[model samples]
Target: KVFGRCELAAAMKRHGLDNYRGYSLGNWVCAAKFESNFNTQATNRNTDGSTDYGILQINSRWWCNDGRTPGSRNLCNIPCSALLSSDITASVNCAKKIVSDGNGMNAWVAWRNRCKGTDVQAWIRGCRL
Candidate 1:
């Protein structure tokens, strides 16, 4: 499921990411735009043997246990397969855990390189979510 801006906004908000930890919907939208293009099945394999999974590209290194990440925490305690589903529920839940790291939204390079301190309102602009 490759989502349009507002559609993803509504879905993420409904799934409990609305204004999540001061990282608003637009912030999330911005990250997804660069990282996954809002595609539910997006993935990227890293040289470290960890892979990013799903629309948000939640990592197997620390979140879902892809079982091939060398030293995985599997903090979300879910199989990586769960994150790639069109439902987006497991992905959203894992995102919350990432936020709770109190590490801020800095885990994703997209946030730092593109969305952070930029005109991120454009992420949700003209979208009637």
Candidate 2:
């Protein structure tokens, strides 16, 4: 879904990820904003010839199948396109798996570059979730 800030917040909360794997909801909120602006259809072609997909912008080089890239870990065992769905269940689950792999939110360069150590409260500022 192309989510509004509050909608994303509510969905994240319902998914049991208002806080997950040591990261807070604010962190996820910030990452989503910087990564894709909450657009599930978002996709980016990286300099490394890989693509990042969906709200969390998970990379095709490691997490999912983009059809052209081979040797992906495919750790989520799901098609990258799956992350582009509004449902976000696969996306959130894969994100959890990513954090569990010990990468934390560091898997997303946007998080490290924008959200990490910054005051990210504004990412969800007016949300009632």
Candidate 3:
């Protein structure tokens, strides 16, 4: 719970995330809201036996290694635990790499289901960026 929606928006903007690859900052915020409720330490299990990590819910299947999970591609080259820190630098950097890998925000189910083709500016409303 490092941030409320507005505060999160502000931080994202400060981090120069207003736009990355082809997605907008709102897309990331919407994904974060549904994926982890803005909690940095959030973790969730997928039915497929993979775990999602951090604010963006990056999966161990391809993005990170949780140690318990074998055969992880670890595209981000990071341990899943590294993403659970209060400092979002690693997580955001990894998320950006995920998007740049050609999935866009569609890699995140939360974004596809809740953010895509929607008016996402509300995610940053009242945040002076």
Candidate 4:
């Protein structure tokens, strides 16, 4: 499923991601924007056989269990498929856990590359809910 900006903003607020672990909703929205274009089913494979799943691109290297990555470490204790489901709570909560675990929003390189230190407000300008 793909999400519009406000739709995703509301979804993030519902999941308590508005200011999760000190990052603003703007940060989350920005990350999702670049990570997967708000595409819930988005998954990308790495050259090392690792993979990223769902909106925020949770990685198989240390986050979810895809069962195919060379060194699968299910830190999120979720099946990779769960991240692709229409309901994004699985990926959302995992994302929260990741930052709370001291990883910060920088866990996703896309965020680091495109969202971090940028004017994140652009990601949530019209979000009113």
Candidate 5:
């Protein structure tokens, strides 16, 4: 599925991230490798109304800026179809919009803290074009 490569790339582009905002792909990969094993479809539930989903382990509801109920049902961010329909630049821009609205890449930051540095190949090897 090209897993992390495609999905993360899509997420980055969707969110208007140019490439590892304050970190590198290696760092992001390190986090992703640990978070969801780079699985964009990954989902997790917490009693505090927090639900992590996708490769980045993002809270789908919060990412899209909505209440938990709608976010849960819709998965917050745009659906696969909407994401797929977008070009790299377009999708990324959308993602950026969502991010800039608030707490951009915060989950990724947490993931990076644990999974980065000594973690995945991305941290050690860095990103490739």
Candidate 6:
């Protein structure tokens, strides 16, 4: 029930995201929190301004396909910053599959790496199949 549909829907509406899947919302939120504390306006000059905006922390270039123009697509392309959709769940699941190679253990291990000493590791232990 973490990051459920209604919650994500409300969040999307508030932030203006579209196409976000439910299960994936949690993953996306986790990634967002981990990457940039969920800062939609975050910017890192070290990455040449390519990394900025969105909860998923999508880099400007990849989201816009243009490294030269920051915020080229803005929230239109990267809805995690705003304009999220129900399909985001699919996005998160797909991304999670890539990260886990379709294995839950690997995914949990990876999640723990980011959530060390914050009860996250314990939560993963409890979630084992």
Model 1 Cα shift for residue 32 (angstroms) = 0.6
Report the lDDT tens digits of candidate 3 across residue range 1-129: 556898788777777777787568888789889889999989898777799998888899889988777678999999999999887888888988887777777888888888888899888877777
Residue 111's C-alpha lDDT in candidate 1?
Answer: 87
lDDT string for model 2 (31-104, tens) is: 99999988999989877778889999998988888887756788899999899898988999999989888787
Ranking by lDDT: 4, 1, 2, 3, 5, 6
Question: How many pairs of residues collide in each model?
Answer: 0, 1, 0, 0, 13, 22
Report the Cα lDDT for residue 43, model 2: 89
Top candidate by lDDT: 4
lDDT of 1 by residue, 1-129 (tens): 898888888888788786889888889989989889989999999898999998989989888898788889999889999999989899888888888976778988888898998988888889877
Clashes of 3: 0
Candidate 2, clashing residue pairs? 1-86
Regions of candidate 4 where Cα sits further than 4 Å from its true position: none
Local accuracy of candidate 6 as per-residue lDDT tens digits, 33-93: 5654544344453455564433343445434233465545532333333313323443343
Candidate 1, residue 128: Cα displacement in angstroms equals 2.1
Candidate 3 yields a Cα-based lDDT of 0.84
For each candidate, the alpha-carbon lDDT, in order, equals 0.88, 0.87, 0.84, 0.89, 0.49, 0.39
Clashing pairs in 1: none
Model 4, 68-89: lDDT tens digits are 9987778889999999998989
TM-score of decoy 1: 0.95
Ranking 1 against 4 by TM-score, winner: 4
Best by TM-score: 4
119 Cα displacement, candidate 6 (Å):
8.6
